Design an enzyme around this catalytic site. Structure first.
Site, mmCIF file in Angstrom:
data_model
loop_
_atom_site.group_PDB
_atom_site.id
_atom_site.type_symbol
_atom_site.label_atom_id
_atom_site.label_comp_id
_atom_site.label_asym_id
_atom_site.label_seq_id
_atom_site.Cartn_x
_atom_site.Cartn_y
_atom_site.Cartn_z
ATOM 1 N N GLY A 38 -14.575 -3.408 -31.056
ATOM 2 C CA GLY A 38 -13.726 -2.106 -30.561
ATOM 3 C C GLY A 38 -12.711 -2.137 -31.398
ATOM 4 N N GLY A 41 -10.734 -7.274 -31.400
ATOM 5 C CA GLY A 41 -11.721 -8.158 -31.460
ATOM 6 C C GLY A 41 -13.130 -8.000 -31.667
ATOM 7 N N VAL A 43 -17.236 -8.680 -30.953
ATOM 8 C CA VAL A 43 -18.088 -8.800 -29.883
ATOM 9 C C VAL A 43 -19.659 -9.075 -30.116
ATOM 10 C CG1 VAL A 43 -18.381 -8.566 -27.286
ATOM 11 C CG2 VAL A 43 -16.933 -7.327 -28.538
ATOM 12 N N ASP A 155 -7.103 3.002 -16.948
ATOM 13 C CA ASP A 155 -8.032 3.565 -18.020
ATOM 14 C C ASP A 155 -9.321 4.172 -17.870
ATOM 15 O OD1 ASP A 155 -8.520 5.091 -20.226
ATOM 16 O OD2 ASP A 155 -8.669 3.224 -21.631
ATOM 17 N N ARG A 159 -16.388 5.935 -20.939
ATOM 18 C CA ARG A 159 -16.377 4.900 -22.207
ATOM 19 C C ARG A 159 -16.048 3.583 -21.553
ATOM 20 N NH1 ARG A 159 -11.675 7.999 -22.629
ATOM 21 N NH2 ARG A 159 -10.130 7.020 -22.143
ATOM 22 N N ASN A 160 -15.384 3.443 -20.487
ATOM 23 C CA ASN A 160 -15.153 2.066 -20.245
ATOM 24 C C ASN A 160 -15.849 1.424 -18.993
ATOM 25 O OD1 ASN A 160 -12.970 1.357 -21.923
ATOM 26 N ND2 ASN A 160 -11.545 2.688 -20.785
ATOM 27 N N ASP A 173 -12.931 -2.481 -18.992
ATOM 28 C CA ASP A 173 -11.837 -1.676 -19.872
ATOM 29 C C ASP A 173 -12.167 -2.527 -21.146
ATOM 30 O OD1 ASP A 173 -9.465 -1.014 -20.662
ATOM 31 O OD2 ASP A 173 -8.442 -1.383 -18.733
HETATM 32 N N1 LIG Z 1 -17.421 1.659 -25.777
HETATM 33 C C1 LIG Z 1 -17.679 0.358 -26.365
HETATM 34 C C2 LIG Z 1 -18.652 0.315 -27.278
HETATM 35 C C3 LIG Z 1 -19.364 -1.180 -27.624
HETATM 36 N N2 LIG Z 1 -19.586 -2.047 -26.277
HETATM 37 C C4 LIG Z 1 -19.690 -3.411 -26.905
HETATM 38 C C5 LIG Z 1 -20.974 -3.909 -25.845
HETATM 39 C C6 LIG Z 1 -22.294 -3.573 -25.670
HETATM 40 C C7 LIG Z 1 -22.850 -4.626 -24.727
HETATM 41 N N3 LIG Z 1 -21.888 -5.274 -24.137
HETATM 42 N N4 LIG Z 1 -22.078 -6.162 -23.282
HETATM 43 C C8 LIG Z 1 -21.044 -6.800 -22.783
HETATM 44 N N5 LIG Z 1 -19.775 -6.533 -23.233
HETATM 45 C C9 LIG Z 1 -19.665 -5.625 -24.113
HETATM 46 O O1 LIG Z 1 -18.423 -5.232 -24.729
HETATM 47 C C10 LIG Z 1 -17.270 -5.313 -23.791
HETATM 48 C C11 LIG Z 1 -17.189 -4.252 -22.756
HETATM 49 C C12 LIG Z 1 -16.108 -4.444 -21.698
HETATM 50 C C13 LIG Z 1 -15.192 -5.614 -22.041
HETATM 51 N N6 LIG Z 1 -13.997 -5.785 -21.087
HETATM 52 C C14 LIG Z 1 -13.445 -6.970 -21.259
HETATM 53 O O2 LIG Z 1 -13.020 -7.599 -22.136
HETATM 54 N N7 LIG Z 1 -12.376 -6.784 -20.188
HETATM 55 C C15 LIG Z 1 -12.330 -6.034 -19.032
HETATM 56 O O3 LIG Z 1 -13.613 -5.214 -19.085
HETATM 57 C C16 LIG Z 1 -11.388 -6.386 -18.340
HETATM 58 C C17 LIG Z 1 -11.504 -5.363 -17.213
HETATM 59 C C18 LIG Z 1 -12.580 -5.677 -16.238
HETATM 60 C C19 LIG Z 1 -12.741 -4.855 -15.076
HETATM 61 C C20 LIG Z 1 -11.541 -3.649 -14.927
HETATM 62 F F1 LIG Z 1 -11.945 -3.045 -14.125
HETATM 63 C C21 LIG Z 1 -10.745 -3.701 -15.823
HETATM 64 C C22 LIG Z 1 -10.429 -4.422 -17.080
HETATM 65 C C23 LIG Z 1 -15.468 -6.395 -22.908
HETATM 66 C C24 LIG Z 1 -16.459 -6.302 -23.923
HETATM 67 F F2 LIG Z 1 -16.550 -7.162 -24.907
HETATM 68 C C25 LIG Z 1 -20.695 -4.907 -24.664
HETATM 69 C C26 LIG Z 1 -18.602 -1.674 -25.330
HETATM 70 C C27 LIG Z 1 -18.437 -0.473 -25.016
#
Ligand SMILES: NC1CCN(Cc2ccn3ncnc(Oc4ccc(NC(=O)NC(=O)Cc5ccc(F)cc5)cc4F)c23)CC1
Length: 290
Positions: A38, A41, A43, A155, A159-160, A173
């Site tokens: 993102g 960090g 992933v 937020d 996208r989130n 998020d």
């Molecule tokens: N828009 C981006 C584009 C890339 N993509 C990466 C991706 C693809 C598949 N996955 N699977 C899992 N996770 C993937 O990425 C991630 C997606 C989200 C997070 N979130 C956090 O770290 N923390 C939170 O969400 C905190 C939080 C929780 C609940 C809330 F209401 C508010 C905040 C971390 C990731 F690493 C991924 C991703 C969405």
């Protein structure tokens, strides 16, 4: 073995990182497979050896490196923020395993279909009004959960929101002025009622299949635009009842906006009337628009 004094963190604060830790003696990381970094960090693709057999796919979250202990509690305090998020429509934390060699990791369940925005924008996908309304319903359910924990997202946007293999949405998020409430634009104050406004914009993203909100607007300068007495237009495939809900989410008086419980209720009814025969197509005028 990191070269930073980590126990100088926040004992009576981030001590809950232990009763959540999951020893490296069960987690395999694939640093070669990067799902996406993102901005703050990297992933990657990961696997979890659940107990003594069950292996599961997941997304490992790691950070840069040495920018001090402050940012290490930031990445941790957060991951711990999800620890209590036990809801099917909220992205959860599998655990946090520590090597302490220069980058702690947070383990999240892998989301096969990525984010809701890219998923709906995909031209090879064929959502119906029902599917899009369903995704919106799932978002409201998670937000209804979060609001009950007094957690203000700040937020919320397509996208989130993440989408898994069963097509279950997980609110997550990863300043977004175009999703912000009028009162937040003016007094930078965020509340649950300000999330409801963002949720109304999110529904518009869903029904437009990921068109950007207010293409033509200065951004910021959205405040002056809204104050002229404007709201996003009803998408072509958006049912009237749903646009009416959007209009409620964007009420000028925050306190007059429906709660997320009411939103789940209202939307579950609307959703229940469709059978999956009305296909939603992309708007010629929104296409390629950034
Ligand atoms: N828009 C981006 C584009 C890339 N993509 C990466 C991706 C693809 C598949 N996955 N699977 C899992 N996770 C993937 O990425 C991630 C997606 C989200 C997070 N979130 C956090 O770290 N923390 C939170 O969400 C905190 C939080 C929780 C609940 C809330 F209401 C508010 C905040 C971390 C990731 F690493 C991924 C991703 C969405």
């Amino acid at each position: 073995t990191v070269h930073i004094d980590l126990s100088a963190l926040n004992p009576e604060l981030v001590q809950a990182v232990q009763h959540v830790v999951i020893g490296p003696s069960s987690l395999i990381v694939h640093f070669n497979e990067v799902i996406g970094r993102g901005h703050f960090g990297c992933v990657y693709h990961g696997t979890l050896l659940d107990n003594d057999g069950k292996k599961i796919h997941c997304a490992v979250k790691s950070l840069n490196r040495i920018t001090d202990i402050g940012e290490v509690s930031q990445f941790l305090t957060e991951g711990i923020i999800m620890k209590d998020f036990s809801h099917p429509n909220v992205l959860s934390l599998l655990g946090i395993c520590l090597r302490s060699e220069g980058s702690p990791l947070v383990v999240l369940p892998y989301m096969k279909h990525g984010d809701l925005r890219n998923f709906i924008r995909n031209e090879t996908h064929n959502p119906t009004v029902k599917d899009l309304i369903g995704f919106g319903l799932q978002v409201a359910k998670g937000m209804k959960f979060l609001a009950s924990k007094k957690f203000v997202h700040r937020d919320l946007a397509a996208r989130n929101c993440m989408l898994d293999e069963k097509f279950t949405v997980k609110v997550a998020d990863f300043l977004p002025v175009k999703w912000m409430a009028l009162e937040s634009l003016q007094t930078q104050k965020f509340t649950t009622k300000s999330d409801v406004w963002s949720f109304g914009v999110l529904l518009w993203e869903l029904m437009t299949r990921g068109a950007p909100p207010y293409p033509d607007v200065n951004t910021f300068d959205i405040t002056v635009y809204l104050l002229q007495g404007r709201r996003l237009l009803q998408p072509e495939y958006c049912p009237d009842p749903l646009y009416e809900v959007m209009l409620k989410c964007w009420h000028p008086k925050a306190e007059m906006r429906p709660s997320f419980s009411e939103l789940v209720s209202r939307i579950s009814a609307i959703f229940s009337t469709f059978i999956g025969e009305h296909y939603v197509h992309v708007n010629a005028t929104y296409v390629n628009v950034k």
